Amino acid sequence: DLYSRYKKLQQELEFLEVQEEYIKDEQKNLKK
């Protein structure tokens, strides 16, 4: 319960950070 929620929250943070980096790279590519 608590540990599962905490672990999924870390996973979803890491996933969202990956999406942020990917979107920033796509923004630079689209500007080019």
Next chain:
Amino acid sequence: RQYYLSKIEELQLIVNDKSQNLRRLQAQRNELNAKVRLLREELQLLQEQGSYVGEVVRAMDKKKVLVKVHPEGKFVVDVDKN
């Protein structure tokens, strides 16, 4: 108990703002994509040649028109489906 709750709350708020930022960034990306695509279609539609301009003498068929292209002359042309 309280360790898990505190960690979960910190992660909840941080990932909530992360998700809002991600939605904003994706909206901006889609706007840039729209701009780039519009420019690309403008280029493509500019590469096609200009079409001739001619007056219609009369319609001959349900699919053929007797036009007069200046200065080439008169043509029996076919009609587009639109």
